[PDB]
Amino acid sequence: THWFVTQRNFYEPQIITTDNTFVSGNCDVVIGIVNNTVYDPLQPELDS
Amino acid sequence: THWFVTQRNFYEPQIITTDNTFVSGNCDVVIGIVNNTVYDPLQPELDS
Numbered sequence A, B: 001t002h003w004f005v006t007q008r009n010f011y012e013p014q015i016i017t018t019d020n021t022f023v024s025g026n027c028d029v030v031i032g033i034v035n036n037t038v039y040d041p042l043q044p045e046l047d048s
Ligand SMILES: *[C@@H]1O[C@H](CO)[C@@H](O[C@@H]2O[C@H](CO)[C@@H](O)[C@H](O)[C@H]2NC(C)=O)[C@H](O)[C@H]1NC(C)=O
Pocket: A033, A034, A035
């Protein structure tokens, strides 16, 4: 029901964030890519 | 003409940032160092 990121060797999920991820290129390149709402921890801290 | 940071074993350049570089000391102690702009993502993000 919800996507997470975990270390490969012991199941301990976390929210998918721009601190837990990095970017290259665009979605039409990766074969088997998926849609997901990636948290940017700066946006609440700019708005509030 | 421009300076990039890239992974050692496959050329894939990135504009040099505070997310890709760490800091120590000052520019006098290093040998063969050069001047270039470091992109700080936070200045556009605060000013937006
Ligand atoms: C991820 O979401 C995007 C939209 O944000 C999907 O893009 C659609 O792709 C279909 C097939 O070509 C088009 O008919 C739609 O018009 C597109 N939507 C928009 C808003 O442009 C994309 O297909 C989704 N990918 C996955 C794997 O779910």
